[PDB]
Design a protein around this ligand. Structure first.
Ligand code: ADP
Ligand code: BEF
Ligand code: CA
Ligand code: CA
Ligand code: CA
Ligand code: CA
Ligand code: MG
Lengths: 141, 732
């Protein structure tokens, strides 16, 4: 992973590490995955933990989190799928109401204006919605 | 121009103003008294917090962390019945001398289970919880070292720890009750009413709770140190002997009283309020028949106690010798001869009786502690949590052998404390990204070696004297002065600035420069006090007792100092294998009263407990630190609700983007913001300036903020997807 990419994953990691000590468990891992439309079982989570949990306590730091993430056509297929997590009805555009759903699922607090503001700033063409290319451009800023 | 803290003879520090600056000292005018003026050395003057009304839960959240702001913050909290405050991972506890309402309730115990330090108000329960959590996660034994002077609160807080661990992580069940009843039983035999404390510990203890691999309680073990022998026979004007003697007389049945020939305490030489001797006997009997002591063993203990009492009544009476020899199973005529023949003078016969009394009682205390250990034993264990409860450095107008032993103990304990605090601060810097922490302490190994080194240490020099044909306190003192003439830590009493110490001759004492200050030891009775072996004629007498119990208490020179050195070294072996937390207990006044903060007295304790050395170790390149969560809590009221809706981490990155604070002065860490000297004070003042200017600074950072909020959730959804695939990728 590049220098830019590692910094963006660190901020993402803070949604997992809500109490802010630099540490993850299976509880955190599960909560966040479900809140984005995924249902991993207890054993699946524990099985993935083992990869980089040298000391058998069930804890994980950020750099270990990155290698737990590591595995040709697969890259773009993942960014397409990330977009569809936001675009719930699959019509090709992210609406204010859809962003808010994602936002609030992840425990973020903001007003409905603030949701509209996030849409407006990501909206290059100015149609009040966020398509795939605007989503990618924002992710890459 | 700003007020500062400067010395005050009774408050420790007072608010004042610098009115003139000289080469060595500053001129101070007190706020209270215009026209009044005084001098203070430049290193005795400290910056004050701008807000004098606030208090923080962790003294690390102070703009300036120093002895004076620490004292003030602790004072503010104390006035509001908040007796607990942090200095990073260290807990300070101020004795309130009354019962505060919710603080120790079983409901309060529950509310602390599982929580990290700082997510709840500061509490001894939070220290106990961190010990268990670190044991479970790090697979490492834990120690909690609790110090302070007599009456400061060590025993009470130790008991709070033991109650917390037992109610929270105990078994069921039944070992639990025994663990919390162990201390109360040892106290009958080891505690005594003193001028400083009605329930004073006259011994040191280390109390271990042992666990298995699953970190379930499997047993306990109690270590005991330095039982005070002199107290058995004579005691000071306003003081008592060990509680047991007074409880036995007060609350025994007509039956026990009859068999043991017991009267009121005024009838016994060895014994002559808010002290419920009668009720305490009942509680002691409850605790005895709960650790599994039967009435047979209980009476065996009472007999020995009573026998020591009647031995004390022998002056150099007839009925006293009768009662004594019966309860200790001796021949009346054998006791008479041994107590009176080498013929012996009046003083020499008083010594023989007192020596037997002390040896019997001491050996009885050993039996009690071993008996408590037999009530919660264990085949094997994985880890322990140990609480150390022993007296700290303290002022005494006369320093003898007892003081010498405890001060030596505290040198080694303070060395451990320095080593562990240094390690935490070094670990903090690298973990947070700050590189090398260059802080250091001055080691005290040279003072440790002066006392304990083989062949040349004071302890070995003392033993040598005990073994001479004609042992002498003065020969011993000269030997020390001769061997250590030019040691940095040792001096002759006549160099003192105190006139009383200067009247002590060279062979009558010495000065040692201890961690906490110079102590002048008077060496009279050192040689006597270093030997706790009973004379062979008295030793044979008590060994051939008709009572099985008395013979088993015992089933020529024995060094008191070297026995303790061995014990202390094993304790340190243990402690060095553990992760350590530190509780510093503080006695607020000399009167046992609540809401009465004596500043100079408290300040002096903060120095003797090692909290001044500690603060120096926390003045690294970045002497100020606060976590994103606490800065968020502290300063969100000053920002627009937009910013207040984050996310303590993003809140802080936002704040330091919008204020544009230099990357040199303000270091964003992994979990904390670190401030250069004075910079936290600068930040605080900026935060409290024009609210509108602040609003405009946020506005200018709007675009970057929105993009960051977007990127946080986009990369997190990628993350989840990448993790989802890993489950599949590893499944196929
Ligand atoms: N946290 C506390 N709450 C209520 N009373 C306390 C507390 N700490 C100490 N005390 C009181 O002060 C007395 C002396 O405390 P103790 O724990 O025996 O001090 P030490 O062991 O340091 O000599 C206790 O008997 C108790 O009355
Ligand atoms: F009086 Be205490 F138990 F140091
Ligand atoms: Ca965490
Ligand atoms: Ca791990
Ligand atoms: Ca849509
Ligand atoms: Ca658009
Ligand atoms: Mg005590």
């Amino acid at each position: 992973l590049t220098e830019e990419q590692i910094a963006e994953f660190k901020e993402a990691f803070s949604l997992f590490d809500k109490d802010g000590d630099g540490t993850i468990t299976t509880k955190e891992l599960g909560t966040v995955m479900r809140s984005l439309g995924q249902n991993p079982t207890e054993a699946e989570l524990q099985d993935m933990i083992n990869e980089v949990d040298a000391d058998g306590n069930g804890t994980i730091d950020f750099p270990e989190f990155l290698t737990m993430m590591a595995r040709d056509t697969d890259s773009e297929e993942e960014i397409r799928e990330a977009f569809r997590v936001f675009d719930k009805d699959g019509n090709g555009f992210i609406s204010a109401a859809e962003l808010r759903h994602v936002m609030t699922n992840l425990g973020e607090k903001l007003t409905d204006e603030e949701v509209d503001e996030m849409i407006r700033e990501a909206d290059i063409d100015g149609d009040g919605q966020v398509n795939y290319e605007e989503f990618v451009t924002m992710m890459t800023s | 121009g700003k007020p500062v803290w400067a010395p005050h003879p009774t408050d420790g520090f007072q608010v004042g103003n610098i009115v003139d600056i000289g080469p060595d000292s500053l001129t101070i005018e007190p706020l209270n008294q215009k026209g009044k003026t005084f001098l203070a050395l430049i290193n005795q003057v400290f910056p004050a917090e701008e807000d004098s009304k606030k208090d923080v839960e962790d003294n690390c959240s102070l703009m300036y962390l120093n002895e004076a702001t620490l004292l003030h913050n602790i004072k503010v909290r104390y006035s509001k019945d908040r007796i607990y405050t942090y200095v990073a991972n260290i807990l300070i506890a101020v004795n309130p001398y009354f019962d505060i309402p919710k603080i120790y309730s079983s409901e309060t115990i529950k509310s602390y289970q599982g929580k990290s330090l700082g997510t709840m108000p500061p509490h001894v329960f939070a220290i106990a919880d961190k010990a268990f959590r670190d044991m479970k996660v790090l697979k490492l034994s834990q120690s909690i070292i609790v110090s302070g002077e007599s009456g400061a609160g060590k025993t009470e807080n130790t008991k709070f720890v033991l109650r917390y661990l037992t109610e929270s992580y105990g078994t069921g069940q039944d070992i639990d009750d025994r663990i919390v009843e162990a201390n109360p039983l040892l106290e009958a035999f080891g505690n005594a009413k003193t001028v400083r404390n009605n329930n004073s510990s006259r011994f040191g203890k280390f109390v271990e709770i042992h666990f298995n691999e699953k970190s379930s309680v499997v047993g306990g073990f109690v270590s005991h140190y330095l039982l005070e022998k002199s107290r058995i026979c004579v005691q000071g004007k306003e003081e008592r002997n060990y509680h047991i003697f007074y409880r036995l007389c007060a609350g025994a049945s007509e039956d026990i009283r009859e068999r043991l020939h017991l009267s009121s305490p005024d009838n016994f030489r060895y014994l002559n309020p808010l002290l419920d001797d009668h009720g305490d006997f009942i509680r002691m009997c409850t605790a005895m028949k709960k650790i599994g002591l039967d009435d047979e063993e209980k009476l065996d203990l009472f007999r020995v106690v009573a026998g020591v009492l009647h031995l004390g009544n022998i002056d150099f009476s007839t009925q006293a010798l009768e009662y004594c020899a019966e309860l200790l199973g001796l021949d009346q005529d054998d006791l008479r001869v041994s107590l009176t023949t080498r013929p012996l003078k009046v003083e020499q016969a008083n010594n023989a009786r007192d020596a037997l009394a002390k040896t019997v009682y001491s050996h009885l205390f050993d039996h009690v502690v071993n008996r408590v250990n037999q009530c919660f034993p264990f085949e094997t264990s994985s880890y322990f949590i140990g609480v150390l409860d022993i007296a700290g450095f303290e002022y005494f107008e006369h320093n003898s052998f007892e003081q010498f032993c405890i001060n030596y103990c505290n040198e080694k304990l303070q060395q451990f404390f320095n080593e562990r605090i240094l390690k935490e601060e070094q670990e903090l810097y690298q973990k947070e990204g700050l590189g090398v922490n260059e802080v250091h302490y001055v080691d005290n190994q040279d003072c440790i070696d002066l006392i304990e080194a083989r062949l040349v240490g004071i302890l070995d020099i003392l033993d040598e004297e005990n073994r001479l044909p004609q042992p002498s306190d003065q020969h011993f003192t000269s030997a020390v002065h001769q061997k250590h003439k030019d040691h940095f830590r040792l001096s002759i009493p006549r160099k003192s600035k105190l006139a009383i110490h200067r009247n002590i001759r060279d062979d009558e004492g010495f000065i040692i420069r201890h961690f906490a200050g110079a102590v002048c030891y008077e060496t009279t009775q050192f040689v006597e006090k270093n030997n706790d072996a009973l004379h062979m004629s008295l030793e044979s007498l008590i060994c051939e007792s008709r009572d099985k119990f008395i013979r088993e208490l015992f089933e020529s020179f024995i060094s008191v100092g070297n026995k303790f050195k061995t014990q202390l070294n094993l304790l340190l072996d243990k402690l060095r294998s553990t992760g350590a937390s530190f509780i510093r207990c503080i006695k607020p006044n000399l009167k046992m009263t609540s809401h009465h903060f004596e500043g100079a007295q408290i300040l002096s304790q903060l120095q003797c407990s090692g909290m001044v050395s500690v603060l120096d170790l926390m003045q690294g390149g970045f002497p100020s630190r606060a976590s994103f969560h606490e800065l968020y809590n502290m300063y969100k009221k000053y920002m627009p609700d937009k910013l207040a809706r984050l996310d303590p981490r993003l809140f802080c990155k936002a704040l330091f983007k919008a204020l544009g604070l230099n990357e040199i002065d303000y270091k964003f860490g992994l979990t904390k913001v670190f401030f250069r000297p004075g910079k936290f004070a600068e930040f605080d003042q900026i935060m409290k300036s024009d609210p509108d200017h602040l609003a405009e600074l946020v506005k200018r950072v709007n675009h970057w903020l929105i993009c960051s909020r977007w990127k946080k959730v986009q990369w997190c959804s990628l993350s989840v997807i990448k993790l989802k695939n890993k489950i599949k990728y590893r499944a196929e």
